[PDB]
Amino acid sequence: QRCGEQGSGMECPNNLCCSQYGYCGMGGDYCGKGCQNGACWTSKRCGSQAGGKTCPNNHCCSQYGHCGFGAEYCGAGCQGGPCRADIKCGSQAGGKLCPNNLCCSQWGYCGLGSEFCGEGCQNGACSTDKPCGKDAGGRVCTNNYCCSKWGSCGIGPGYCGAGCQSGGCDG
Amino acid sequence: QRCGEQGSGMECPNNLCCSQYGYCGMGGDYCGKGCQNGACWTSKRCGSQAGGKTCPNNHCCSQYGHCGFGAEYCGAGCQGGPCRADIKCGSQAGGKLCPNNLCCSQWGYCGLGSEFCGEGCQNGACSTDKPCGKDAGGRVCTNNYCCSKWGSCGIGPGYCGAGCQSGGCDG
Ligand SMILES: CC(=O)N[C@H]1[C@H](OC[C@H]2O[C@@H](O[C@H]3[C@H](O)[C@@H](O)[C@H](O)O[C@@H]3CO)[C@H](O)[C@@H](O)[C@H]2O)O[C@H](CO)[C@@H](O)[C@@H]1O
Ligand SMILES: CC(=O)N[C@H]1[C@H](OC[C@H]2O[C@@H](O[C@H]3[C@H](O)[C@@H](O)[C@H](O)O[C@@H]3CO)[C@H](O)[C@@H](O)[C@H]2O)O[C@H](CO)[C@@H](O)[C@@H]1O
């Protein structure tokens, strides 16, 4: 239920602002001073102008490095988030990965749903579930995901714990 | 640190899958059966198809009522979320309010950032706190937000509890 640092990076539903103390709400108490994520009155920096950091809550990063929605943020110059432009990736783009765990279609563009994560998916939250490791001819996961003992890619102690074949192993 | 139901409608950062058990991670144990939000393998339903339902994590609802990202989703047809087309609202669109607490600009389009939430903001998460209640001519807030004791609009205990002048007051 807590959010921000007090909630492990958690986000509030419906763009609700996460107060500096880690609770979800709307109003100055949450959206004002110390706002962690959500519709912060005080807009979060991103991309080029902010060390490459991405926007939380899947907001778009304007050409100016500010987080939000609308033509201004998602239109021309958008550096991140659901940009109105099509985001290239995969072999077709220097082997690039999609941002914020987006899947890369076989056609070389970023997205989510069966058309992007389905078959041909190059990276991101692909739902194909290709095996990795000892039995996959030594295959390693994409996105530094952890290859578990059963030889599946994922993130969470069950994938990254002891017996973590490769990737972001805790162990 | 719980997501979905077990964490009060809370969502994971970076489109991480909220498991049936309320924990964030990626993989089948998270993104497969039971997934409550995030980049679930079997995409969430929305729109007119699912009773008017919005998409979690600010995903787009395609014309067919499935949640995701990419041309197919946010492109033509888009029913909700950060569509490619501009979302009209306010007095221009029949006093229509923006979805997901988005701000309705002075011009009749939804968004987040100083441009939609500042001067002229019509509904949604405006950063401007127009006073409500007794000391405001008995003005009421937009979106059924709670007019608080001290005379401010917001959501959360402080605003909707004891001294809630109007709105989504509980007590
Ligand atoms: C979309 C976006 O990221 N807006 C930022 C804003 O952008 C910084 C640049 O602003 C340009 O001027 C904007 C101005 O801010 C708007 O109010 C106006 O309506 O449109 C013009 C378009 O150019 C300047 O040209 C440029 O020098 C930058 O300053 O910055 C503010 C904070 O400064 C931010 O809150 C907002 O999200
Ligand atoms: C954008 C969207 O909502 N996609 C839905 C899809 O929507 C109905 C249409 O499905 C098309 O089929 C998909 C196919 O399932 C994808 O895997 C493939 O890569 O692309 C096509 C085109 O989007 C039909 O061709 C079209 O006529 C519509 O009926 O429905 C599917 C379930 O059928 C859903 O999984 C997908 O997320």
UniProtKB/Swiss-Prot annotation, chains A, B:
Record keywords, A-Z: Chitin-binding, Disulfide bond, Glycoprotein, Lectin, Pyrrolidone carboxylic acid, Repeat
Disulfide bonds: C3-C18, C12-C24, C17-C31, C35-C40, C46-C61, C55-C67, C60-C74, C78-C83, C89-C104, C98-C110, C103-C117, C121-C126, C132-C147, C141-C153, C146-C160, C164-C169
Superkingdom to which the source organism belongs: Eukaryota
SUPFAM superfamilies per the UniProt record, alphabetical: Plant lectins/antimicrobial peptides
Residue numbers binding substrate: 10-12, 62-73, 114-115
Chitin-binding type-1 domain boundaries: 1-42, 43-85, 86-128, 129-171
Subunit structure: Homodimer, u-shaped.
Further details from the record: The 4 sites proposed for binding to carbohydrates (N-acetyl-D-glucosamine) of receptor molecules are on the surface of the agglutinin molecule.
Reported function: N-acetyl-D-glucosamine / N-acetyl-D-neuraminic acid binding lectin.
Name assigned to this protein: Agglutinin isolectin 3
